[PDB]
Amino acid sequence: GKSHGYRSRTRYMFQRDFRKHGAVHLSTYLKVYKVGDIVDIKANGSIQKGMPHKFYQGKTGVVYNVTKSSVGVIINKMVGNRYLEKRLNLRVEHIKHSKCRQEFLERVKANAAKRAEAKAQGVAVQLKRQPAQPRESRIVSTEGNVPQTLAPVPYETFI
Amino acid sequence: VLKKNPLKNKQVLLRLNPYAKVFAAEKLGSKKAEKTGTKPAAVFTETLKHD
Amino acid sequence: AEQVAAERAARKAANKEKRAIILERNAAYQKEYETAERNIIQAKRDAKAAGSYYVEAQHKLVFVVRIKGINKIPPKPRKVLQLLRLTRINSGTFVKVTKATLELLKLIEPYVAYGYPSYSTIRQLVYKRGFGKINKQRVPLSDNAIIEANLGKYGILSIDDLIHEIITVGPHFKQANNFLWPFKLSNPSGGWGVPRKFKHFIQGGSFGNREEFINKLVKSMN
Amino acid sequence: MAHFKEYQVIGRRLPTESVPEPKLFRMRIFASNEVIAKSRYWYFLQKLHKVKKASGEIVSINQINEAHPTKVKNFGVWVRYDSRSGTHNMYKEIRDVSRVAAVETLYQDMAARHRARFRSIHILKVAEIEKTADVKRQYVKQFLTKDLKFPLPHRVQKSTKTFSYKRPSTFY
Amino acid sequence: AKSKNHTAHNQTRKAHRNGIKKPKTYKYPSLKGVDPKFRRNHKHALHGTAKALAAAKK
Amino acid sequence: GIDHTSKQHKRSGHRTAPKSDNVYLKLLVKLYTFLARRTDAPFNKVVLKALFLSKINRPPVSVSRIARALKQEGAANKTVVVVGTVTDDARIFEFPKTTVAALRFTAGARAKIVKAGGECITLDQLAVRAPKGQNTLILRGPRNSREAVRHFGMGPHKGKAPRILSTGRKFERARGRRRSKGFKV
RNA sequence: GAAAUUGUUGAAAGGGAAGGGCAUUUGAUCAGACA
RNA sequence: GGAAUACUGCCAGCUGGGACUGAGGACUGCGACGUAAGUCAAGGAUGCUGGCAUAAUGGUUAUAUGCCGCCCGUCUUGAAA
RNA sequence: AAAUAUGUAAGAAGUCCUUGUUACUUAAUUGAACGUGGACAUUUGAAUGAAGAGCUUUUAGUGGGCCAUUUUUGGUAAGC
């Protein structure tokens, strides 16, 4: 009959990259994780212990526990019409520091600097991002750039 | 009790926008533009008539 | 009985001062409208005389009209239409042109016809079909008092100031535009001009981006 | 697709820091109005250069008017069109007074004789034949005869009323 | 008398009538499943700082 | 054709008038409806809304609860307002000299308050003394202490009480409750 | 002393069914105010 | 070299004919025209005039005419069957 | 190695300075977690919208489906 094992349909998901087999680089075991850190999950095929399920591949969670060689991750999973809270025990080979919020730490640092610099000069520091506004007016010079006339080409085979 | 449309009822048109009286008095809807005598460059007209 | 002429005289005096402010402001807006349009025309003449080309700035304001009914609509286009307050056919709403709003327009492209409104179209829409959202109620814009009472903190004190914030996208465009109830237009008096509406304007239908041609369509529906 | 006007459309790629002031490209477009002309510009530019609307801009669009709208001219047109199976090249000659009034005749003839719609026709070139005997289509040469003269037999007159009280005549 | 086996038709429409609710976030989340050794010393740290705060406002 | 974003003709979901037919209670509603309309004081609106509650939403407030509320810093000389019945508590042995206004006082609660030197007044007298609810304090009883609440949300690993008639050794302690019999909850 | 059903008298319509909805013509019949 | 006109757009430019509607019921508001008193098309129709005062309008009912209308109840994905 | 769908973040439950607790941890007042006090208000951290948000108890009916565009399996095909 039908088969729904733990690692079913994971033929290509858990493979290693091309010419990227073998041992794990040492920098994986030297990074430090704390409670509240935001990390994303990517299973490693060389390590069969503490490997997450195929559902959580490519999902981002928040660290809530630290252990000897593993951490706890909280992920919200949609079940039916609501979301449930999931807790996973994954070793450090399967996770890394997500950069989704890392960029946000620079803007808040930059917002504090910009506000302080303009505090003694002018109000309305404009500490909000804006979308790509429509282009303004401009003048296009034809000096050495006279337009070239183009026409559709006929049909040919060249086979 | 009953909404009245400006531009069809002059009194309501004068209730809001009091400047409407000045606009009609000076005939600002038919203002003449200042004359200019600029001519396009030879590059523009040659490109316009270019095949 | 007291306070029968004292407060009436004071209240009428206050009304006259407000009338003078509106009179002076509308004069200023008229001057800047005329000056801006003449400069653009003059710039084009100067560029041609110099052997160059004057590229006008891209438009910042669009007016979107829903031209289809409420049946057989896929979910994602349906949700976007609700976010633009287009719940019935022939409804209109001004949208500020940004990078985020352009992607919204592409999704609901088959169901709406939008373009670039002019000052004349905006003025006639507000005067004839201008309704405000006050305490979740649709209140006709029949006097300047209601505009002052709901938009005074944003510097708007007249119906022409409301029009000014629309034609020229100001810092308070979001609050002014959200104040206006979505416009309820009728069918065009001269028709749509095409045998089948539900084709792109380029191919010969109704929906799409018809740019300045929207002004002819809106006036027929208004 | 409607009454035709001739628009000059000049476009350009968006300037970058590596190559500011890029080249300008121009092409004549026959279109009903201004909206269609700009759309057709990107349709033909996407078949020639690595550029599209998102990464490009329209520099200037201008309408082209005939220098001599009231002089009879002989026009030769080269077209590329798609049939129900394959693509064919074609050369036809049209006698008229203006380019806009000669392109509309071409679209009527293509739809009538080959069932080709607007979407499957490309106008390669429209040119005016200046010298006689360069015309190679007999249906045009017959109108170039010295002192052209032909009658109009069998005239039919429209009637405004349902009934007529005399037998009509087709004299002219 | 064979019949239909399985389908996901109309399932997501029912789920969107009242569902798809983001879970509530609470300050001080539950400490279930955390390291027992960490929890033991954390209890004494909270007990110690309570005495220190009370001693300052005796 | 309107593409509704929400349900139409939906009722608010809150009580507007009391469900009871008590003539004296409706008099209090009429009195505080006038106050809540022409006094713009948040106390009046709270009292008017509280007059519509049902019996389970108006738990009794004991005298011990009143005494504990009077031990707050600076609240020893406030008028305690309880929209409901005030019951007597024999666990407490001392009682202050406060002023309490409530719908009903039990035969024991009224005696204890008066003997301590205080007074028991009705809600209509409070409007005379405190039209805007000055120096007032509203107390409410516990709702989740009700017997029916402990059976709500029954399910596996919830720790809720089961709906059972007879409690004993042979009543819902077998398989499904302990590891020795199949499994535990 | 009801209905199904039937006789007589009176009125009406009817070219392979009858009955019904909207509007009005025709025939018969009828209430309301004359302040 | 100097004009005209076509096409497109704007006017808080003027003006003629037709159709449907008259809701509300002391005053209160925002305005306009006036030195003023006042007036006004300004928070919803008034003025003038004629015929008839009854089966004339109208109601009910029968018939005729234009268009439309398949037999209800039920099981069913689906019933005039 | 696409297109379309898909996880997370876009602040007050935040950022920064200083120092209190512990039986955990460190060669070590080293670190971890939790705190006292001080500083920065709502262009307070993109867009749009919001007949308001959140929560609870109880119960009916249903648990034979079918059609169309598109993706797609078996079969020569089917109103399969």
Ligand SMILES: [Mg+2]
């Ligand atoms: Mg093992």
Ligand SMILES: [Mg+2]
């Ligand atoms: Mg369709």
Ligand SMILES: [Mg+2]
């Ligand atoms: Mg017509």
Ligand SMILES: [Mg+2]
């Ligand atoms: Mg049509």
Ligand SMILES: [Mg+2]
């Ligand atoms: Mg089934």
Ligand SMILES: [Mg+2]
């Ligand atoms: Mg009988």
Ligand SMILES: [Mg+2]
């Ligand atoms: Mg009659």
Ligand SMILES: [Mg+2]
């Ligand atoms: Mg009939």
Ligand SMILES: [Mg+2]
């Ligand atoms: Mg029929």
Ligand SMILES: [Mg+2]
């Ligand atoms: Mg059957």
Ligand SMILES: [Mg+2]
């Ligand atoms: Mg049936």
